[PDB]
């Protein structure tokens, strides 16, 4: 609820439209948002049904000149972008300025791989869908309709996860040492007096 400089959302496990509506209102109200791991987004409904929906989208094109028609972007971040732009008054200057506050990415490129990522519980699939309902992963859907970089993103994400795990092991060791040091100084005058203050 606080005003942040930049909110970086981990897109993994978020339902497309719910996250899109929340992000749209955030950027319209002046908050900069970055969404990463858009290939890990979810859409409710089975894969074949969402594939059919995307093919019905592909069917729409300007008859007299296909180059003028709707442009069907295939990458997962562009699927999320299309969902968001549909919830923005993008033909006004204010809508354009709102859309400039948004960034969307496959994977977690720099500099966001060393920054905190948050989640949006009102849009989380595991929290929203009834436990037995089928869903789609946007990365699979994109690859089925012409996105070309599923395997590159997968390889780079594996490398990032190795590096991040080593980072975390170091941070955990440091935290363990710091916890030992704070345990050595408990039952002190300051420790007891802070405890009287709820701290």
């Amino acid at each position: 609820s606080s005003f942040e400089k930049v909110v970086v959302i981990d897109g993994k496990g978020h339902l497309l439209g719910r996250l899109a509506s929340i992000v749209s209102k955030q950027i319209l109200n002046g908050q900069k948002v970055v969404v990463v791991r858009c290939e890990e987004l979810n859409i409710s409904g089975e894969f074949f049904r969402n594939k059919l929906k995307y093919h019905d989208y592909l069917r729409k094109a300007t008859r007299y000149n296909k180059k003028k028609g709707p442009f069907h972007f295939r990458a997962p971040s562009r699927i999320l972008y299309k969902a968001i732009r549909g919830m923005i008054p993008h033909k006004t200057a204010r809508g354009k300025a709102a859309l400039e506050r948004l960034k969307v990415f496959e994977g977690v490129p720099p500099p966001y791989d060393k920054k905190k990522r948050v989640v949006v519980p009102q849009a989380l699939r595991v929290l929203r869908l009834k436990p037995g309902r089928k869903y789609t992963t946007v990365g699979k859907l994109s690859s089925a309709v012409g996105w070309k970089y599923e395997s590159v993103v997968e390889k780079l994400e594996e490398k990032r996860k190795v590096q991040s795990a080593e980072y975390y092991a170091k941070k955990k060791a440091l935290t363990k040492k710091l916890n030992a040091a704070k345990a050595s100084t408990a039952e002190s005058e300051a420790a007891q007096k802070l405890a009287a203050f709820g701290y």
Partner: protein
């Protein structure tokens, strides 16, 4: 809380032929007293050849639940109208009051049969006192020895829009 149970007592207006006309009573489930008296006259005009203008309401009284914090099972007998015809049916509900069971019944007939309040007559509401009287398995399964069950997949409601920690559904 949507409803209250009332008794409504009425009679025909006294005339020369009948100085002491017979008092009649109905148990009515209504949001307030105005609707309660309306329902009383509706049923009296169906059952008997009487009108509101030639009769009078004698008394209207809330009937409070006898044991509001005792768990009970109710059987309710109903007459309802579908899109196609007119039907009788009997359903069972678990509750601590008759009004709670009636409110649940109205929700249930709205949900499964698209029966609006205007389409339903409540024939009879009875506290089932012996477990043998419970006929429906959808309420019977809560009447077994040492009933215990978990509540898997808990969803915690968040005050903030952004959470800094990964979700959990343990419980």
């Amino acid at each position: 809380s949507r409803l209250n149970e009332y008794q409504v007592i009425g009679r025909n207006l006294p005339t020369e032929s009948v100085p002491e006309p017979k008092l009649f009573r109905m148990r009515i489930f209504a949001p307030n007293t105005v609707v309660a008296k309306s329902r009383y006259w509706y049923f009296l005009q169906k059952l008997h050849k009487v009108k509101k203008a030639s009769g009078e309401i004698v008394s209207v009284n809330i009937i409070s639940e006898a044991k509001p914090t005792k768990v009970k099972t109710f059987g309710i007998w109903l007459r309802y109208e579908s899109r196609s015809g007119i039907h009788n049916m009997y359903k069972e509900y678990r509750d601590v009051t008759r009004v709670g069971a009636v409110e649940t019944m109205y929700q249930d007939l709205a949900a499964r049969h698209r029966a609006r309040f205007r389409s339903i007559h409540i024939l009879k509401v009875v506290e089932l006192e012996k477990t043998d009287d419970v006929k429906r398995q959808y309420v019977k399964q809560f009447l077994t020895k040492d009933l215990k069950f978990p509540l898997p997949h808990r969803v915690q409601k968040s005050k903030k829009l952004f959470q800094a920690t990964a979700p959990t559904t343990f419980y």
